[PDB]
Amino acid sequence: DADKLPHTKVTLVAPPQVHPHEQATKSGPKVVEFTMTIEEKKMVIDDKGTTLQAMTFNGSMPGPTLVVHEGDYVQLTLVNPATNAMPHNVDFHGATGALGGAKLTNVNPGEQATLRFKADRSGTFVYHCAPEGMVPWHVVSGLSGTLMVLPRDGLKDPQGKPLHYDRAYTIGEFDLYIPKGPDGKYKDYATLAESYGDTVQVMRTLTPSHIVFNGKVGALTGANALTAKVGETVLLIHSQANRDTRPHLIGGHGDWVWETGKFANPPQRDLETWFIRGGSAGAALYTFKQPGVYAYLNHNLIEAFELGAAGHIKVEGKWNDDLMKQIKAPAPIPR
């Protein structure tokens, strides 16, 4: 009986960070309380000033990552403030019944609701808005995130050996369908509702105009690059709520990867490129061995470099000549 379990509130943090949590824990099942607030906003998505009429959990794309342990209950209050124009709900892929909770969380602007569900399966799971009659529009406008359900004893390799990360990062990849006018330029809409019909038309062609990590071209670059050091293990959580992606770390690997995202299954090792099915989240472990600026990207290189599905990881530390060495620098072809 979940009603008689300990109840704890967790404060969420903005992507690419994940809120503080234990991996292995000695503690028993708890009801973990989260709150999220829908924010509809116009967002600049590229270095030309192209805007999206966006819909977000907590003002960000992706929504924040919620972390519990297997056997815990997730208890979410979803707030849809009167400042919004559309109704919303939430469908958790980690939950069982009522369309993921969508049937029980239909909130019109000015309303809120509270859902509890048992997180009885370990893994990274997508959550997204799913209002009947307009599911794809709400999802592609930015309403998705990840729930991570860790095993109580933490992550394990195929032989049951413990795997540990020093930092988790969360990347949400968003296929965007921005309409154009007769002049060939991207439309700019005064309101969210004005964007609807044209956006649906672009959606039906199945060709995204942009594909971005975390809400914009270059979101995870420059001052906002991910960071690490040699010897550090990172967990990279990657969600795509609508479309397939194929993550790749340039100069690195996926040491252990759950590409389907489910921790009771044995991970795969040494992956160059992995595969996140549209409507899922996956996770990769990597321990950095070389310093430098890595690219983390969708390995359809057109989608990465032309459409925006790429970020950076800046890594400090000592170069290893055993792993890689320049034997002869670029120089004239000998006579």
Q: Sign of torsion, CA 200 202 208 211?
A: negative
Is the Cβ–Cβ distance between 6 and 163 less than 8 Å?
A: no
Mark 185-224 with x for binding to Cu ion (rule: CB under 5 A) and - for no binding: ----------------------------------------
Task: Give the contacts of 25 (CB within 8 A, at least 6 positions apart).
Answer: 69, 152
Q: Please tell me the distance from the alpha carbon of residue 300 to that of residue 181, in angstroms, as a whole number.
A: 27
Residues 222-281 that bind Cl ion (CB under 5 A): 222
Q: Which listed range, 20-28, 165-173, 182-190, 319-327, lies at the site for its own copies (CB under 8 A)? A: 319-327
* Nearer Cβ to its own copies (14/99): 99
Q: State the virtual CA torsion across 27, 16, 239, 86 in degrees, nearest 10.
A: 100
Phi/psi for 223 (5° steps) reads -70, -25
Residues 168-227 that bind Cl ion (CB under 5 A): 221-222
Mark 109-138 with x for binding to its own copies (rule: CB under 8 A) and - for no binding: -xxxxxxxxx-xxxx-xx---x----xx--
* Nearer Cβ to its own copies (44/293): 293
Kindly report the number of other CB atoms within 10 A of residue 324's CB atom.
10
Mark 39-78 with x for binding to Cu ion (rule: CB under 5 A) and - for no binding: ----------------------------------------
The verdict on 183 binding its own copies (CB under 8 A) reads no
Q: Which does 307 bind (CB under 5 to 8 A by kind): Cl ion, Cu ion, its own copies, none?
A: its own copies
Considering only 32, 54, 56, 88, the residue that binds Cu ion (CB under 5 A) is 88
Q: Please tell me the distance from the alpha carbon of residue 292 to that of residue 249, in angstroms, as a whole number.
A: 12
Q: How far is the CB of 169 from its own copies (least distance, A)?
A: 19
* Nearer Cβ to Cu ion (59/279): 279
Is the Cβ–Cβ distance between 282 and 238 less than 8 Å?
A: yes
Q: Which listed range, 15-23, 57-65, 108-116, 135-143, lies at the site for Cu ion (CB under 5 A)? A: 135-143
The verdict on 268 binding its own copies (CB under 8 A) reads yes
Is the Cβ–Cβ distance between 173 and 298 less than 8 Å?
A: yes
Considering only 129, 234, 249, 315, the residue that binds Cu ion (CB under 5 A) is 129
Residues 26-55 that bind its own copies (CB under 8 A): none
Q: Which does 129 bind (CB under 5 to 8 A by kind): its own copies, Cu ion, Cl ion, none?
A: Cu ion
Q: How far is the CB of 40 from Cu ion (least distance, A)?
A: 9
Strand partners, 310: 297
Task: Give the contacts of 69 (CB within 8 A, at least 6 positions apart).
Answer: 22, 25, 29, 119, 149, 150, 151, 152
Q: DSSP per residue over 247-291, as a string?
A: EEETT--EEEEESS--TTSPPEEEESB--B-TTEEEEEEEE--S-
Phi/psi for 203 (5° steps) reads -50, -45
Q: Which listed range, 45-53, 185-193, 221-229, 237-245, lies at the site for its own copies (CB under 8 A)? A: 237-245
The verdict on 307 binding Cu ion (CB under 5 A) reads no
Structure tokens at 1: 């009986």
Nearest C-alpha neighbor of 168 from the set 233, 117, 229, 86: 233
Q: How far is the CB of 184 from its own copies (least distance, A)?
A: 12
Which residue ranges make up the site for Cu ion (CB under 5 A)?
Answer: 88, 129, 131, 138, 279
Which residue ranges make up the site for Cl ion (CB under 5 A)?
Answer: 221-222
